[PDB]
């Protein structure tokens, strides 16, 4: 029936039919004003700011402590009966033994895991409980499947990290990592293998975070405040969140790919029973014998500094190392496998479960009840508000996962908007929205070292430089003789590695082409898909998938940006919040046709477990598609390098199913009927630093952070002594004029300017230069001037605006409309902003007089704005 497609400060949403109609639906208005409904399309955006609110706190050590306490409590619930049979008070004395002799004996002898592993003799149950407690306390860290050689393979997950980094930067894409060398040495050795990468780079810092350093990604993304990261450190989730939400959500699973690389390196250094338990034999032996030998040598040589080493907690020695708040790095400096601590990459649960298998099997015979609970104990370690926690568990804090916190709330009521009906496709994407410096850097490096698609659009829509170069099948072998020149561009970094292939790339050439467009490397969208797939599929699949029942699609926005340029459905951002809505419309337009046309490609871009069909089988000879592009059938005509044009059918369908998937004579008509002006654009209301101003009975008085607490306790006395309207509260008056409450001292524009698509698409065509249509320009300015008088109320500035167009009327249609785009900033909802219109500038105002609000109508909007409670007092 329908479909849905979905930044730092905006969340776009839209709804789409098979013919790409955005539904026009009335919305009930429950306010006392003479307004019962509004005709708005099922499209829009949600804007938000990054501020310290309740949600900001909710999406940011205590919860980790409670999780570990719950895990150990679940273990103790099983252990308690036999524990009381052995030692009743052992559990309570933990934050070791109840008597001095046993305690001291355990102190020199075992100040256990691999004795439960190797020794077959029956051991004390206290010892097993302690072993399992340290099993489940430091569980570690991402893999649903069982442990296999594939998880550990350093090459495999390093390559996975390289792909996730390279397909996030299309312009700029074991013996070393598992070596028993210094972490800095391993990092330098890895960096030396990749030219053009520095230690301070994002990739060098990610490798270090996989290795053990303390990378600071602030220099990698130009932040103002420190962004220390440390996997071993407890609060790595919170610090990771703060950094990535300062710098954008797209790198979250880049960082998590680094995290899994660290996991792989740990597993690798371990397995070459429970080999981590052999590694802790190494750790314990070195630590304890080195401590004893140091004690002996200090006794024999420096008796005075002995007490400083072993008994002065305040000083920087071992005494402060173990019992005080002293780090290892200073301790080694005062005096890396010498004296490693108990609370120290978080060892993968694949390693730990390897011990749970090793420990329990070696002792399952002697204790029958532990053998019976073999599978349960495995589930204890590997099992997992909660949704607020998981986004906190993801690699992003509120700052930009506020929208990803919103995008769930956006979609959750969007389900209600369409009457609980479920969408077929939900396309999501994340990209930075500084690239001009990027294209400059490669040119500087490429020169220092020393238009047509390489593969045409018939095989895939790739207008990026990786495919663009300034017969029908890719470059012929006659052209392949130029590869000597292509090699000089590869080593000069003027071209990427895959481009060196694609130029020289039959069917094996086309096999990788489809995958890149559809396979999604941004797994944050997969994590969002996981959230979408978990919240949608409560009815778990019976077997072999465990999940089905309505799809989650993650297409790249590249299938949209190409879709915009081809068929006259262009986008202008600064006009209004429709451009996010326009992308959210042209996002899922791709989804409806692609799946019904190529169901075999489902596994490549849709969430869930599916049969991996051989792409070689689907690609055929010159006689679904021979030409590999999934979006060829959108065009009626196919363009090749030679200039020969391949015809296409008027109506497209799927051969193996027979369903019509594409109506060229009818679907193109409906799309233009979409972009042409009432749309659900909703600004979510959110709670000497004043928080919010409450109406007083009439005037507004601000409440600082301190006063609110006393306000909730005794509001009457607090109101009496001086003599909730949240920030950006919708304030409407007279002919649709709208205001938002910036503070007690200022107001904001709440009126969104709209344009019928003829006036929209023209602006992009003009700005990116139909010259007979110069009469559209006068109407646009007139429509702007008419819009300015009704709601903006800046008649002093507006007179200059109308004059300025008269001064520069001789200028071309292009530059004129480009300055019109900047002129649109005056009308946009939100904080007013100064701008330049031709030479004429200023055009800025501050609605400090808020007296209108006292008699105005408030409109308390939901996130989608459907349920409005308009209370007008006057």
Whole-angstrom distance, CA of residue 597 vs CA of residue 601:
9
Whole-angstrom distance, CA of residue 725 vs CA of residue 304:
69
Q: At what angle do helices 664-675 and 578-597 cross, to 10 degrees?
A: 160
Whole-angstrom distance, CA of residue 256 vs CA of residue 524:
10
Would you say 623 is a known binding-site residue? Answer: no
Count the neighbouring beta carbons within 10 Å of the beta carbon of residue 136: 19
Which residues is 663 bridged to in the sheet? 651
Task: Name, in order, each residue with C-beta under 8 angstroms of 851's C-beta and a sequence gap of 6 or more.
Answer: none
Would you say 580 is a known binding-site residue? Answer: yes
CB 133 within 8 A of CB 116: no
Q: Is 357 exposed, middle or buried (0-12, 13-18, 19+ CB in 10 A)?
A: middle
What DSSP designation does 324 have? S
Whole-angstrom distance, CA of residue 658 vs CA of residue 240:
49
Q: At what angle do helices 125-137 and 349-363 cross, to 10 degrees?
A: 160
Would you say 839 is a known binding-site residue? Answer: yes
Q: Which run of H or of E encompasses 638?
A: strand 637-639
What DSSP designation does 314 have? S
Which residues is 870 bridged to in the sheet? 859
What DSSP designation does 140 have? -
Q: Give the CB-side neighbour count of residue 117, counting CA atoms within 13 A.
A: 21
Whole-angstrom distance, CA of residue 7 vs CA of residue 9:
6
CB 158 within 8 A of CB 150: no
Helix ranges (H only) for 418-539 are: 435-449, 477-480, 483-491, 497-504, 507-518, 523-536
| Data resolution in angstroms | 4.0
CA angle 685, 686, 688 (to 5 degrees): 125
CB 45 within 8 A of CB 584: yes
Whole-angstrom distance, CA of residue 873 vs CA of residue 629:
60
| φ, ψ dihedrals at 40, nearest 5° | -130, 140
CB 594 within 8 A of CB 630: yes
Whole-angstrom distance, CA of residue 741 vs CA of residue 726:
7
Whole-angstrom distance, CA of residue 869 vs CA of residue 874:
16
CA angle 839, 841, 846 (to 5 degrees): 175
| Longest pairwise C-alpha distance within the chain | 101
Per-residue three-class SS string for 571-602:
CCCCCCCHHHHHHHHHHHHHHHHHHHHCHHHH
Question: Beta-strand (E) ranges in 89-134?
Answer: none
CB 125 within 8 A of CB 83: yes
Task: Name, in order, each residue with C-beta under 8 angstroms of 243's C-beta and a sequence gap of 6 or more.
Answer: 217, 218, 223, 227, 229
| φ, ψ dihedrals at 291, nearest 5° | -60, -45
What DSSP designation does 106 have? H
Whole-angstrom distance, CA of residue 154 vs CA of residue 365:
36
Closest CA to 353 of 445, 267, 466: 267
Give catalytic status of residue 453 as yes or no: yes
Closest CA to 407 of 866, 4, 868, 3: 4
Task: Name, in order, each residue with C-beta under 8 angstroms of 178's C-beta and a sequence gap of 6 or more.
Answer: 154, 265, 268, 269
Whole-number Cα distances in Å, 613 to 36, 419, 426, 616, 843: 53, 36, 23, 9, 60
Whole-angstrom distance, CA of residue 321 vs CA of residue 146:
38
Whole-angstrom distance, CA of residue 416 vs CA of residue 405:
18
CB 266 within 8 A of CB 257: no
Q: Is 255 exposed, middle or buried (0-12, 13-18, 19+ CB in 10 A)?
A: buried
Q: Give the CB-side neighbour count of residue 464, counting CA atoms within 13 A.
A: 20
CB 370 within 8 A of CB 360: yes
Count the neighbouring beta carbons within 10 Å of the beta carbon of residue 520: 22
Q: What is the SS3 assignment for 121?
A: coil
DSSP per position, 732-786: EETTTEEEEEEETTEEEE-------HHHHHHHHHHHT--GGGTHHHHHHHHHHHH
Whole-angstrom distance, CA of residue 232 vs CA of residue 212:
8
- Residues shown for the chain: 874
Annotated catalytic residue: which of 352, 453, 579, 582?
453
The torsion angle over the Cα atoms of residues 592, 596, 601 and 602, rounded to 10 degrees, is 70
What DSSP designation does 792 have? I
Phi-psi category of 686—alpha, beta or left, where left has phi over 0 and alpha has psi -120 to 50?
A: beta
Helix ranges (H only) for 27-124 are: 54-58, 62-86, 90-93, 100-109, 113-118
Q: What is the SS3 assignment for 415?
A: helix
Task: Name, in order, each residue with C-beta under 8 angstroms of 520's C-beta and a sequence gap of 6 or more.
Answer: 526, 554, 555, 556, 605
CB 743 within 8 A of CB 703: no
CA angle 88, 91, 96 (to 5 degrees): 105
Closest CA to 429 of 538, 517, 550: 517
Q: How many helices (H) and strands (E) does the chain have?
A: 40, 19
The contacts found for 687-695 with CB under 8 angstroms, 24 or more apart, are 687/53, 687/54, 687/724, 687/726, 687/727, 690/743, 690/744, 692/724, 692/725, 692/726, 692/727, 693/725, 693/741, 693/743, 693/744, 694/724, 694/725, 695/725
What DSSP designation does 480 have? H
Measured in whole angstroms, how far is the alpha carbon of residue 476 from the centre of its chain? 41
Q: What is the SS3 assignment for 190?
A: helix
| φ, ψ dihedrals at 679, nearest 5° | -140, 145
Whole-angstrom distance, CA of residue 646 vs CA of residue 637:
6
Q: At what angle do helices 303-310 and 275-301 cross, to 10 degrees?
A: 140
Would you say 775 is a known binding-site residue? Answer: no
Whole-angstrom distance, CA of residue 251 vs CA of residue 236:
15
The torsion angle over the Cα atoms of residues 567, 571, 575 and 579, rounded to 10 degrees, is 120
Measured in whole angstroms, how far is the alpha carbon of residue 849 from the centre of its chain? 41
Whole-angstrom distance, CA of residue 131 vs CA of residue 79:
12
Whole-angstrom distance, CA of residue 43 vs CA of residue 577:
10
Whole-angstrom distance, CA of residue 711 vs CA of residue 189:
61
What DSSP designation does 422 have? P
Per-residue three-class SS string for 701-733:
EEEEHHHHHHHHHCHHHHHHHHCCECECCEEEE
Closest CA to 208 of 229, 222, 226: 229
Q: What is the SS3 assignment for 24?
A: strand
The alpha carbons of the chain give a radius of gyration, in whole angstroms, of 32
Whole-number Cα distances in Å, 233 to 82, 195, 327: 35, 31, 12
Q: What is the SS3 assignment for 658?
A: coil
Q: Would the CA dihedral through 53, 55, 61, 63 be positive or negative?
A: positive
The edge-to-edge listing of strands for the beta sheet with 857-860 is 746-749, 737-743, 730-733, 857-860, 869-872
Closest CA to 262 of 173, 148, 351, 199: 351
Q: Which residues of 588-627 are buried (b: 16+ CB within 10 A; e: fewer)?
A: bbbbbbbbbbbbbbbebbbbbeeeeeebeebbeeeebbbb
Method: cryo-EM
Q: Which residues of 723-736 are buried (b: 16+ CB within 10 A; e: fewer)?
A: eebbbbbbbbeeee
Whole-number Cα distances in Å, 188 to 202, 442, 565, 610, 822: 14, 23, 44, 41, 48
Whole-angstrom distance, CA of residue 533 vs CA of residue 536:
5
Which residues is 737 bridged to in the sheet? 733
Closest CA to 116 of 281, 251, 264, 307: 281
Task: Name, in order, each residue with C-beta under 8 angstroms of 138's C-beta and a sequence gap of 6 or more.
Answer: 343, 346, 347, 352
Closest CA to 625 of 602, 592, 656: 656
Whole-angstrom distance, CA of residue 221 vs CA of residue 244:
10
Q: Which residues of 754-766 are buried (b: 16+ CB within 10 A; e: fewer)?
A: bbebebbbbbbbb
Q: Is 16 exposed, middle or buried (0-12, 13-18, 19+ CB in 10 A)?
A: buried
Q: Would the CA dihedral through 278, 280, 286, 291 be positive or negative?
A: negative
């Amino acid at each position: 029936k329908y479909s849905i497609g979905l930044g730092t400060n905006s969340v776009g949403w839209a709804v789409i039919t098979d013919e790409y109609k955005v539904p026009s639906k009335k919305f009930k208005v429950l306010g006392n004003t003479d307004r019962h409904s509004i005709k708005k399309n099922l499209i829009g955006a949600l804007l938000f700011d990054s501020g310290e609110t309740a949600e900001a706190t909710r999406l940011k050590a205590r919860r980790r402590y409670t999780r570990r306490k719950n895990r150990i409590c679940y273990l103790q619930e099983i252990f308690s009966n036999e524990m009381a049979k052995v030692d009743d008070s052992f559990f309570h004395r933990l934050e070791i033994f109840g008597n001095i002799v046993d305690e001291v004996a355990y102190h020199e002898k075992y100040p256990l895991r691999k004795k439960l592993v190797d020794s077959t003799d029956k051991a004390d149950l206290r010892l097993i409980y302690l072993a399992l407690a340290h099993m489940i306390k430091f569980r570690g860290h991402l893999i649903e499947g069982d442990l296999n050689p594939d998880n550990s393979d350093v090459d495999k997950l390093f390559i996975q990290l390289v792909q996730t980094y390279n397909q996030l930067f299309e312009e700029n894409p074991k013996a070393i990592l598992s070596a028993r060398l210094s972490k800095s040495r391993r990092l330098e050795n890895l960096i030396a293998q990749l030219p053009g990468e520095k230690k301070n780079g994002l990739f060098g810092n990610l490798i270090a975070l996989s290795l053990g350093l303390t990378p600071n990604f602030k220099s990698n993304f130009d932040l103002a405040e420190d962004a220390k990261l440390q996997l071993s450190k407890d609060t790595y989730d919170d610090d990771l969140d703060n950094l990535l939400a300062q710098i954008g959500d797209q790198y979250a699973d880049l960082f998590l790919a680094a995290k899994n690389l660290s996991d792989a390196i740990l597993l690798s250094d371990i397995l070459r029973k429970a080999p981590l338990s052999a590694s802790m034999i190494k750790r314990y032996d070195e630590h304890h014998q080195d401590l004893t030998l140091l004690k002996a040598l200090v006794r024999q040589q420096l008796p005075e500094k002995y007490k400083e080493i072993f008994f002065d907690q305040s000083k920087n020695g071992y005494a402060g190392y173990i019992d005080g708040g002293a780090s290892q790095e200073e301790f080694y400096k005062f005096i890396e496998d010498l004296l490693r601590k108990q609370r120290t990459g978080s060892i993968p649960h694949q390693i730990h479960l390897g011990e749970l298998h090793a420990i329990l099997r070696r002792q399952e015979d002697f204790y029958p009840f532990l053998k019976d609970n073999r599978e349960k104990i495995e589930k204890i370690l590997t099992f997992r508000d909660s949704l607020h926690e998981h986004i906190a568990n993801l690699a992003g804090s509120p700052a930009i996962k506020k929208g990803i916190l919103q995008t769930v709330k956006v979609v959750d009521e969007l389900v209600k908007v369409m009457g609980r009906h479920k969408p077929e496709n939900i396309v999501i994407e994340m990209a930075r929205e500084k690239n001009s410096r990027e294209r400059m850097k490669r040119i500087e490096e490429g020169i220092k070292e020393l238009v047509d698609h390489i593969v045409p659009q018939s095989f895939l829509k790739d207008d990026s430089i990786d495919n663009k170069v300034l017969d029908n099948v890719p470059s012929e072998e006659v052209v392949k003789k130029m590869k000597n020149y292509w090699r000089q561009l590869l080593n000069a970094k003027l071209i990427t590695q895959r481009k060196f292939d694609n130029l020289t790339k039959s069917e094996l050439d086309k096999a990788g082409f489809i995958k890149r467009q559809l396979v999604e490397t941004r797994q944050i969208t997969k994590h969002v898909a996981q959230i979408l797939d978990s919240r949608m599929n409560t009815k778990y699949d019976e077997n072999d998938k465990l999940i089905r029942e309505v799809k989650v699609i993650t297409l790249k926005s590249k299938l949209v940006s190409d879709f915009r340029k081809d068929f006259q459905f262009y986008k202008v951002r600064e006009i209004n919040n429709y451009h996010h809505a326009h992308d959210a419309y042209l996002n899922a337009v791709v989804g409806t046709a692609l799946i019904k046309k190529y169901p075999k490609l489902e596994s490549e871009f849709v969430y869930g477990d599916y049969k991996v069909y051989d792409v070689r089988k689907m690609i055929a000879k010159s006689e679904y598609f021979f030409y590999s592009n999934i979006m060829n059938f959108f065009k009626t005509e196919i363009t090749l390098a030679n200039g020969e044009i391949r015809k296409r059918p008027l109506i497209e369908t799927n051969g193996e199913t027979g369903e019509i998937v594409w109506d060229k004579g009818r679907d193109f008509a409906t799309v233009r009927k979409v972009l042409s002006p009432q749309v659900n654009i909703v600004k979510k209301t959110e709670v000497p630093t004043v928080a919010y101003s409450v109406l007083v009975v009439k005037e507004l008085l601000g409440i600082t952070i301190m006063e609110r607490s006393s306000f909730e306790k005794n509001p009457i006395d607090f109101l009496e002594a001086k003599g909730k309207l949240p920030k950006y509260s919708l304030f409407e008056l007279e002919n649709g004029r709208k205001r938002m409450l910036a503070s007690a001292g200022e107001l904001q524009k709440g009126n969104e300017l709209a344009l019928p698509s003829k006036y929209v698409n023209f602006l992009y065509l003009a700005s990116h230069y139909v010259e007979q249509h110069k009469h559209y320009l006068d109407e646009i300015i007139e429509q702007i001037s008419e819009f300015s008088k009704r709601v903006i109320l800046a008649d002093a500035n507006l007179d200059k605006v109308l004059s300025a167009y008269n001064k520069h009327r001789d200028k071309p249609i292009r530059e004129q409309a480009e300055n019109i785009i900047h002129l649109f900033t005056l009308t946009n909802l939100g904080a007013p902003a100064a701008f330049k219109y031709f030479d004429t500038t200023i055009d800025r105002k501050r609605y400090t007089s808020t007296k209108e609000v006292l008699d105005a109508t408030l409109i308390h909007q939901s996130i989608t704005g459907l349920y409005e409670t308009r209370i007008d007092l006057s």
